[PDB]
């Protein structure tokens, strides 16, 4: 149609083409214009002319007030970080140095810089630079501690709710508890002095910290406490933040009726306000796909991580931890979904991507690098079985052995010996030893895996049953201890149908194993007794398979706020 | 908080073992073995390595004494002495050895 | 395929 | 034991001699002909005050067990102080 | 005329970490820590190299099963001083 | 420990003192170099005289606000405390021009 | 234990933090301060703020004169070129623009622009950016040659001896010979006016030009003029350059005893004067390992390339051409060292690094990519035969087929069909065809190289004996022509003991090439004869092989430069 | 192997 360009979009391209002469005068332009000049520099690809200005804190304070075009700033910021220049670490250090100089000032200048820190530290934390956002908040925190009145106590607890969030994406859990304890010190002081603070966002972080350390018993306790303080006056960003973390603790609690209403309300609440492109919406989808994968709704769990990844791949550039986290979970979901098929080439690409990103931006001994490392190892051991080349079978299976042990060490260093995540690596390493023909070694890993999970989770739980089936296949298919395997298969059968029914698609490896269990010990009557149940499993799975996609399952306005909270709280 | 109990017990088992003060060698083994099955298998690792070091110290001192008797040249130590060997990564006795020393010619 | 989905 | 540290504008900044020995130039100024006054006709007083503030900051915080706080150097003074740091070799 | 003393023996390496498994050099390797901390403990030797980078013997054996270079310095690996 | 500077006209005394010390002993430090009688010399922080009876901690010179990098100030008189100099006023850049 | 930060190093952090308000005022700082401010921009990661302050020649030249911390400057400069910014090209264009703007000015003012060109040209050539250091020197030679007087001819030859170095190092050999012809003009002008300059740097650099072009006979005869020009007043930089390039010519003409005393004195001279981690000392070690690779000390040569790569990887960063050639020499030395062991995992990585770097900083049609493409395929061929997969065997050699084809095409473009460097590509390609099931043309590739190598060197050189042993091994195992294969092992065996001795490492590959040549020919008594001498070869290898660190072998040479240069000329 | 070191 050949429509001419607006005079604005023409004057933008004429001051950018004359940027060297006009760099001094551009910084004096209004915020809406100034960001559009800088975004034009990114569009032209002149990142050096741009990162020379974002490294200054004052300019990055001006381009942080453009809230409409923040989604363009994240892609412009992430492009700088991959370009070279450490624009995140320079901004965080340049703020801490400037923040440390106004300690001997009044409460007007200090509140000006604290608000800069809350939008800068609120941006680096949003872009994934948790190790660099914490340095901003730790400087904002020490501004609130200087003045000990009722006014600044509400900001010190506003830093500690954010410090507790940048210390979980950075997997610094052992500092998280000390942060929460310091928050209560600034909460009890404020609450006692005739001013009650909303303790809803802060307890939501503990619903993810204690979830991360596999304290699901403690996670659900703070899940209830978080939602008891949900008020309609809270920001939607805070409210959707509590819901997604509350869902993750409820799903791992293996109760799914209360879990769906929390996260489907969260996805709706993060889609009507934030829209289908804001990273927070994709953040909710990532936790929504956690619900789908644990309820055996694996078919549409891949489609919700792919949606979650595609949002983050557009807002958060190439090499970002948030993109890498989506690559990790999508690789795991594609691993689970296509486990039966045995084809892992898209899943391997996603798992390899999540390591090519995290190893670039995180140290070699980071906990989040360990969880993303186990997913490649799970994929590698299946390729090391499906491939028919013995040389490839041995070497690829050995590579997956170094990844689990490296992943186990990082989990064992921070989560301790007695945790589900540490035991989750024992079970994965147990399955690997089964494929490595080390059936003697595979016995003691699963025994240590079940004993840790049984002691912590309980005698009957979904995670315990899924670990037993790993041991049951060991005692049945390649160790010939059918008497020992007889109770193990039955143990997982009861738990498997306890929370999913007979149509649980994971029972295929449980029912078929029972058929091979009875094939070598006689009693062929029970072979047909389990043979029709496998057909019953076939009938009860494909009939319920036909269901609409979860993206439209939430639809438009399914329920209302302050109603899902009350419905969940009373139950 | 069982972790702080292990540190507190190790800081006291180490002082108990090296001084020769013990009810019996098997009694400390039984206490160590009980924690291995009660709390955790890897919980009593440094504590268990604190044991089995004095147990092999008697074996090693037999070898050490036999070493000097089988020496080609006649070397007499003079002052009789025995040594308990201790792993650096197990015993809590490392502390901060920032002070030097020069033992005289008597040993 | 006999060990079900890896945890 | 005290060193008369005058400025360009005739401003004196006397301090303990062991504190003034951090900078290698002042140690060289004390040596030779003339614990007395030393000519500082180039360095101004507003930046030499920060040098003297650094002197007690350097000596007191040597081999400190705790983490040393950042020495504050204001943006308006940073460029002039840096040349003073090089000239004094502090 | 009679004496008795202790000896905090440790391996000659000062790096203090097994670069493959990240465990402490004196502690058992991550492979020994995985299955049994006592049955396989006694053979958790350390192996040095020509580049003088002492690692856990089980860890360096796992490393040599897949790759053929020292992890820290990318030179070739030749044992010298099995401890 | 409390670090302070003492300024009468332009002389400056960068000498530390204990937070529990009194003004009396700090006056003896001034006469060590100024070689003047201590009774004549009087000190005036924020244009306010300090009693010799009260200790350093009672004058607001807390050790937590008397760091070596930014020591607190106190006047002196036998006030004419002239400023050191005016640092060059750097541009704010973002100001319009 | 937590020492306080220096006031200088704290004011540096304060000035850098106010970069926006002082970036035009930092340039007024002293020369030593200015580098340390611009260093903190690299340390803090502010590459983009630094890149706009090293692309400017008016401020980069002030940084370059801070020669105390030049080892840090090479790290910052290299950290910018792979960052994305073209600091080398922009500094080349900025200086050429200044030269044209100042050419019409007074010759006295023109001398100052020459000195900046020597500093900037001497830096960009030290960093392995000859393609952009050429324009700095070209705009310096052109500037100095406008006025022809006795003062300008001193700089004109200096602008040309450096131009020879930056053209020879960039594989502009054809332009190098023309460049030396310009040098012959200015020396005559200086000589005819009652002046004499030292031509040791110029003559020695010409030797590297002829050595690269495989004119070993013409290169070695040029060492003598280079060596005799060495005096006491020459800089150590020049003396190491003459000795290092004379050693490469000496070791290629099979004069190892004379080559030894030279390069073992070059290494000591570089270490005694140029620290221990200077790029020049890395340059000496990279050609000291060249000497030890050609005198059958491969087990010690790779331990010196690792001592020359680890120097070039700490001064220069990645994506440099100096760390690229240090990779390509170690990737080949480890390939020779692990030929028997089959442990080419290290030698493949050090060859992919050299390939992944030169393909990024150099165009596709460059000769420096040829010498690194051949090596990567050499490791790539023995990885396939070690593997037990038909699918991997075909594709790996097919990749090795293209790499030799690319190397041969790239080498023939500049050298020609009758040079040893192009001849060596046929010999490596022929050995590849020995496992490519292309035996009919495999002998053709060998014999094409054989008659070239004999033509250029002779019948008594070690270079041809390597392919002769390879060509006859083709007959023994694939062509089944045992008649004309036994006549070539004897030629290879006789020259092995004549040149090296009985401990030559290649003597196993034709002694065991005779234990099977005579096995299927009928003779059985002579089979026991060569079975005995192979054990004799093993029995003398045990005592001959002494693994001593050659870095500490050259610790303190009791001879100075005067004795070595005279001892070399006395023998020759 | 069969062949000598490459060159
Ligand atoms: Zn290890
Ligand atoms: Zn071990
Ligand atoms: Zn190493
Ligand atoms: Zn840049």
Curated annotation (Swiss-Prot), chain A:
E3 ubiquitin-protein ligase activity of the CRL2(APPBP2) complex is inhibited by APP. It is found in: Nucleus; Cytoplasm, Cytoskeleton; Membrane. It holds the Pfam family TPR_10. Rapidly degraded by the proteasome upon overexpression of a C-terminal fragment of APP. The keyword Lipid biosynthesis does not apply. TPR repeats lie at residues 44-77, 114-147, 200-233, 282-315, 327-361, 423-456, 465-499, 508-541. It is a peripheral membrane protein. GO terms for biological process: intracellular protein transport; intracellular transport; proteasome-mediated ubiquitin-dependent protein catabolic process; protein ubiquitination. Its main location: nucleus. One of its GO terms (molecular function) is ubiquitin-like ligase-substrate adaptor activity. InterPro entries: APPBP2, TPR-like_helical_dom_sf, TPR_rpt. Keywords: Cytoplasm, Cytoskeleton, Membrane, Microtubule, Nucleus, Protein transport, Repeat, TPR repeat, Transport, Ubl conjugation pathway. The keyword Transferase does not apply. Gene3D superfamilies: Tetratricopeptide repeat domain. Pathway: Protein modification; protein ubiquitination. One of its GO terms (cellular component) is microtubule associated complex. Component of a CRL2 E3 ubiquitin-protein ligase complex, also named ECS (Elongin BC-CUL2/5-SOCS-box protein) complex, composed of CUL2, Elongin BC (ELOB and ELOC), RBX1 and substrate-specific adapter APPBP2. Interacts with APP; APP interaction inhibits the E3 ubiquitin-protein ligase activity of the CRL2(APPBP2) complex. This is Amyloid protein-binding protein 2. It comes from Homo sapiens.
UniProtKB/Swiss-Prot annotation, chain B:
Neddylated; which enhances the ubiquitination activity of ECS (Elongin BC-CUL2/5-SOCS-box protein) E3 ubiquitin-protein ligase complexes. Neddylation leads to structural rearrangment in the complex that allows interaction between the E2 ubiquitin-conjugating enzyme and the acceptor ubiquitin. CBC(VHL) complex formation seems to promote neddylation. Deneddylated via its interaction with the COP9 signalosome (CSN) complex. It is found in: Nucleus. The Cullin neddylation domain restrains the RING domain of RBX1 in the E3 ubiquitin-protein ligase complex; this restraint is removed upon neddylation of the cullin. Core component of multiple cullin-RING-based ECS (ElonginB/C-CUL2/5-SOCS-box protein) E3 ubiquitin-protein ligase complexes, which mediate the ubiquitination of target proteins. CUL2 serves as a rigid scaffold in the complex and may contribute to catalysis through positioning of the substrate and the E2 ubiquitin-conjugating enzyme. The E3 ubiquitin-protein ligase activity of the complex is dependent on the neddylation of the cullin subunit and is inhibited by the association of the deneddylated cullin subunit with TIP120A/CAND1. Belongs to the cullin family. This is Cullin-2. It comes from Homo sapiens (Human). The lineage of its organism: Eukaryota, Metazoa, Chordata, Craniata, Vertebrata.
UniProtKB/Swiss-Prot annotation, chain E:
A zinc finger (RING-type) spans 29-74. Changing residue 53 to A: Strong reduction in ligase activity. Signal peptide: none annotated. Disulfide bonds: none annotated. It is found in: Cytoplasm; Nucleus. The keyword Transmembrane helix does not apply. It comes from the Eukaryota. GO terms for molecular function: cullin family protein binding; molecular adaptor activity; NEDD8 ligase activity; NEDD8 transferase activity; protein-containing complex binding; RNA polymerase II-specific DNA-binding transcription factor binding; ubiquitin protein ligase activity; ubiquitin protein ligase binding. The keyword Membrane does not apply. Keywords: Acetylation, Cytoplasm, DNA damage, DNA repair, Host-virus interaction, Metal-binding, Nucleus, Phosphoprotein, Transferase, Ubl conjugation pathway, Zinc, Zinc-finger. One of its GO terms (biological process) is SCF-dependent proteasomal ubiquitin-dependent protein catabolic process. GO terms for cellular component: Cul2-RING ubiquitin ligase complex; Cul3-RING ubiquitin ligase complex; Cul4-RING E3 ubiquitin ligase complex; Cul4A-RING E3 ubiquitin ligase complex; Cul4B-RING E3 ubiquitin ligase complex; Cul5-RING ubiquitin ligase complex; Cul7-RING ubiquitin ligase complex; cullin-RING ubiquitin ligase complex. Zn(2+) 2 binds at residues 29, 32, 44, 58. Zn(2+) 1 binds at residues 18, 21, 56, 59. Its EC number is 2.3.2.27, 2.3.2.32. Changing residue 32 to A: Strong reduction in ligase activity. It is an enzyme of class 2 (transferase). Widely expressed. Zn(2+) 3 binds at residues 51, 53, 70, 73. The RING-type zinc finger domain is essential for ubiquitin ligase activity. It coordinates an additional third zinc ion. Belongs to the RING-box family. This is E3 ubiquitin-protein ligase RBX1. It comes from Homo sapiens (Human). The gene is RBX1.
Curated annotation (Swiss-Prot), chain F:
This is Elongin-B. It holds the Pfam family ubiquitin. Pathway: Protein modification; protein ubiquitination. Residues 1-65 form the Ubiquitin-like domain. One of its GO terms (biological process) is transcription elongation by RNA polymerase II. SIII, also known as elongin, is a general transcription elongation factor that increases the RNA polymerase II transcription elongation past template-encoded arresting sites. Subunit A is transcriptionally active and its transcription activity is strongly enhanced by binding to the dimeric complex of the SIII regulatory subunits B and C (elongin BC complex). Core component of multiple cullin-2 and cullin-5-RING E3 ubiquitin-protein ligase complexes (ECS complexes), which mediate the ubiquitination of target proteins. By binding to BC-box motifs it seems to link target recruitment subunits, like VHL and members of the SOCS box family, to Cullin/RBX1 modules that activate E2 ubiquitination enzymes. Component the von Hippel-Lindau ubiquitination complex CBC(VHL). One of its GO terms (cellular component) is VCB complex. PROSITE patterns: UBIQUITIN_2 (PS50053). Coiled coil: none annotated. PANTHER family: ELONGIN B, TRANSCRIPTION ELONGATION FACTOR B POLYPEPTIDE 2. Disulfide bonds: none annotated. GO terms for molecular function: transcription corepressor binding; ubiquitin protein ligase binding. InterPro entries: ELOB, Ubiquitin-like_dom, Ubiquitin-like_domsf. Belongs to the Elongin B family. It is found in: Nucleus.
